[PDB]
Amino acid sequence: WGGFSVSNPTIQRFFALHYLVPFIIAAMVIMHLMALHIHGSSNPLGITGNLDRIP
Amino acid sequence: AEVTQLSNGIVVATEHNPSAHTASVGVVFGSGAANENPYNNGVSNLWKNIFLSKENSAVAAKEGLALSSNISRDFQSYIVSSLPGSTDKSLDFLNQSFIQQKANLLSSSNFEATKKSVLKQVQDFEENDHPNRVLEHLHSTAFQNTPLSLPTRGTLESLENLVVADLESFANNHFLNSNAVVVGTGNIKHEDLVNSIESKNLSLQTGTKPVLKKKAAFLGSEVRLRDDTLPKAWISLAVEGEPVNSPNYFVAKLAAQIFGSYNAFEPASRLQGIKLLDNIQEYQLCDNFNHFSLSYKDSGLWGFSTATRNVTMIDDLIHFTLKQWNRLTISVTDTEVERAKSLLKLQLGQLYESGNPVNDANLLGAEVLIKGSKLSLGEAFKKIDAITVKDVKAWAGKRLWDQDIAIAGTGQIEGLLDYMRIRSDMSMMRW
């Protein structure tokens, strides 16, 4: 809280954090895409897709 | 030089070469694999092997004669070679064995044995001759559902069902006086050849060849015959080209001479003045390539063929070669045109002056069967020397810039990209 209840210290620090977390999200999306690029995506048939691929 | 007469329904064309040591006579018909249908494909291939059967060749050998035969898409020929003093001996053999008395050749125990051997030649071709079977599938997919798509050797299913009555049907419709040219090349004289046909009363049937319904039509498509057990990748790629009698016949041949051929293992082929070699030698994209310009009666093909072992960089090989074709439309130097002029004249001069009378007979009969006469080599050199840079740009703009293509390939072709990715490379957004 920064005090005894929800007050001026709380609102001012919540805006500083609302600015920061989106840039952390952008960093975890890259880690998300890096782990996908290992084996590639899946398909609705649930079987291997190595026999037919398109760019 | 060459002389052509029409004494009757048959036409006599000659090419006297007094400084030769052999002579050849024969007959060339204006029909080929383009005058068949899917169900009798390969009949004209069976007729060639009957002419070259053991019994037929034994009679000719005892007289000092050699037999030759060739089957193309628009023509087929039957030639007899002999020494210069035995021309009338070859005309008699051709008459008594091919023009008339064709039933003894078509006898049983001779048709069966010949058919069994041709089935073996076709099976071996379809399993071992990868560069040539890819070029045959290029015709099959570029002219699908059309006369110009049938292979010149037939298929295993047409031949396996061919029967005793199928070969006699074909010769009735196509071996006629109006469809034939009698050709004499080497150490022979025009007057001596015409005076021999007029004495022996040589004559074929007096019908007329059937008229097809469809015509040749190019269609952008692709066929892929993947085979991971093969060690290489063979690919053919072409656009629609020029037929014979086209005004742009020598421009399309000069355009193919600009990129030429290449052999990675020949030291002198790596020093050629082709800018494409600068992009493909750093990482060894291919083993060999060659550019062609095929011309038929109705249409033609213009492209190239490759064989490579760099299976992971096939896209670079296709991408770089098509970007060089883009320069014909927009920016091609004067030096490139002048260099290709000198190499095309040398290439044509070798083809028409090989010194083999059998080769000249095939070229002479095929030309007369279409154009009615034959263009002189000196006249062709004048037309080649008159081509300009503006002619190349105009031709490539209408035939190459942003046009559909036909693709065929076999082997390890997993790295060959989709049609639209390759198709989009035929122009460029920068110009």
Side-chain angles (χ1 to χ4, degrees):
Chain A
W1 274 340
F4 306 100
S5 72
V6 173
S7 36
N8 177 58
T10 325
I11 296 310
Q12 288 215 293
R13 71 171 65 199
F14 276 2
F15 176 62
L17 294 179
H18 183 74
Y19 210 132
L20 164 78
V21 190
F23 287 105
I24 302 177
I25 285 165
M28 306 292 305
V29 166
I30 281 149
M31 299 176 74
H32 193 60
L33 300 184
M34 272 168 45
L36 160 86
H37 211 50
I38 302 157
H39 316 277
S41 58
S42 190
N43 56 76
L45 288 176
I47 50 174
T48 167
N50 271 332
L51 295 95
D52 201 353
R53 300 252 174 192
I54 47 187
Chain B
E2 301 180 2
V3 193
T4 312
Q5 288 171 81
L6 188 130
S7 60
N8 194 270
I10 53 82
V11 191
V12 180
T14 201
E15 222 178 305
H16 183 39
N17 189 3
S19 95
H21 298 127
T22 44
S24 61
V25 311
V27 46
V28 200
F29 295 117
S31 289
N35 293 80
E36 318 186 19
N37 62 71
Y39 298 77
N40 65 340
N41 203 20
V43 161
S44 180
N45 198 38
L46 260 185
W47 258 115
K48 163 201 177 147
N49 282 266
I50 292 270
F51 183 74
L52 304 173
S53 51
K54 177 153 149 253
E55 300 116 281
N56 205 48
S57 324
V59 189
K62 283 170 231 149
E63 287 251 272
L65 310 171
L67 306 192
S68 64
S69 177
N70 176 31
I71 311 292
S72 288
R73 270 161 213 289
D74 287 331
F75 67 95
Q76 52 198 267
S77 60
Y78 305 86
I79 323 283
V80 180
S81 318
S82 165
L83 285 175
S86 282
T87 44
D88 259 331
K89 262 165 98 281
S90 34
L91 257 183
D92 265 350
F93 178 83
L94 201 67
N95 197 353
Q96 294 311 61
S97 296
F98 203 62
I99 277 66
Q100 53 195 241
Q101 294 105 42
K102 64 179 180 180
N104 38 315
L105 285 84
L106 289 194
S107 96
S108 185
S109 299
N110 186 26
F111 171 82
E112 283 318 298
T114 295
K115 171 181 192 211
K116 196 144 312 289
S117 94
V118 173
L119 274 174
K120 183 178 179 180
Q121 302 170 251
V122 154
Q123 188 216 60
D124 276 77
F125 167 82
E126 216 71 49
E127 303 176 317
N128 300 320
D129 200 353
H130 309 306
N132 267 332
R133 65 184 291 241
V134 165
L135 201 57
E136 286 284 67
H137 276 91
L138 188 70
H139 292 78
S140 193
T141 203
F143 305 112
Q144 47 181 91
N145 309 118
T146 283
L148 217 39
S149 71
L150 297 156
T152 52
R153 296 166 184 81
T155 79
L156 271 194
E157 200 34 72
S158 308
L159 296 159
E160 267 183 48
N161 222 327
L162 281 191
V163 86
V164 188
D166 283 318
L167 265 69
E168 259 172 343
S169 202
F170 186 86
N172 288 312
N173 295 91
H174 293 280
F175 292 170
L176 324 158
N177 300 273
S178 45
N179 204 29
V181 175
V182 168
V183 158
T185 38
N187 213 300
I188 209 178
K189 284 199 150 325
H190 194 59
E191 316 69 33
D192 289 345
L193 182 63
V194 297
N195 264 94
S196 300
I197 313 158
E198 297 167 306
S199 319
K200 311 183 174 285
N201 256 348
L202 214 180
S203 167
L204 299 120
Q205 310 192 30
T206 56
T208 323
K209 154 178 60 157
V211 183
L212 300 137
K213 297 311 186 46
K214 290 242 177 89
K215 183 178 179 180
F218 187 86
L219 184 72
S221 40
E222 63 173 14
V223 51
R224 302 177 177 230
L225 295 174
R226 201 168 142 179
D227 194 349
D228 283 340
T229 68
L230 295 184
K232 288 182 167 202
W234 297 267
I235 286 136
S236 270
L237 200 141
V239 309
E240 201 188 16
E242 315 279 340
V244 294
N245 83 354
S246 172
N248 294 132
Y249 178 73
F250 286 120
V251 176
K253 298 222 308 270
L254 195 132
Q257 198 65 230
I258 281 170
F259 308 110
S261 312
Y262 170 70
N263 195 6
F265 304 102
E266 209 74 27
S269 68
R270 320 175 68 90
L271 308 162
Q272 291 178 284
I274 309 164
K275 305 193 182 175
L276 179 57
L277 298 185
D278 300 0
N279 317 132
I280 60 156
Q281 285 195 3
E282 185 171 357
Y283 303 75
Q284 301 138 58
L285 293 179
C286 76
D287 278 328
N288 59 82
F289 63 78
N290 65 293
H291 284 71
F292 50 82
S293 193
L294 308 173
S295 284
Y296 305 109
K297 266 209 59 45
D298 297 330
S299 66
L301 293 179
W302 193 100
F304 59 88
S305 290
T306 47
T308 190
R309 275 185 334 270
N310 200 348
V311 296
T312 52
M313 293 184 77
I314 297 179
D315 53 327
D316 294 288
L317 175 70
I318 302 310
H319 164 74
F320 274 136
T321 183
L322 258 48
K323 278 288 159 267
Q324 283 292 321
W325 296 0
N326 281 127
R327 304 181 48 242
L328 285 181
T329 312
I330 57 165
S331 66
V332 48
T333 76
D334 195 7
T335 300
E336 289 173 279
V337 172
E338 302 312 309
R339 169 206 178 264
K341 269 169 176 186
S342 274
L343 289 187
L344 186 67
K345 296 196 292 180
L346 176 84
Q347 176 230 325
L348 280 192
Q350 282 185 308
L351 203 77
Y352 286 91
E353 297 158 349
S354 61
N356 190 6
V358 169
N359 283 343
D360 296 348
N362 289 272
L363 291 170
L364 163 67
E367 183 133 359
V368 175
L369 270 163
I370 294 173
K371 302 154 120 278
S373 57
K374 162 120 160 194
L375 184 77
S376 201
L377 189 71
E379 269 170 344
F381 278 24
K382 273 183 217 113
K383 308 182 74 165
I384 292 170
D385 274 346
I387 305 180
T388 43
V389 179
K390 275 201 60 129
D391 302 342
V392 185
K393 262 170 203 192
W395 174 84
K398 81 156 276 199
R399 286 289 196 201
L400 269 162
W401 190 262
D402 201 26
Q403 290 281 353
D404 289 345
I405 59 201
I407 313 159
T410 205
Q412 298 182 38
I413 53 171
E414 199 215 84
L416 184 69
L417 287 176
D418 282 312
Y419 185 92
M420 275 305 255
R421 192 79 176 261
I422 305 176
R423 160 86 168 79
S424 80
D425 184 1
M426 291 280 309
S427 50
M428 58 214 192
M429 329 199 253
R430 92 188 90 146
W431 191 101

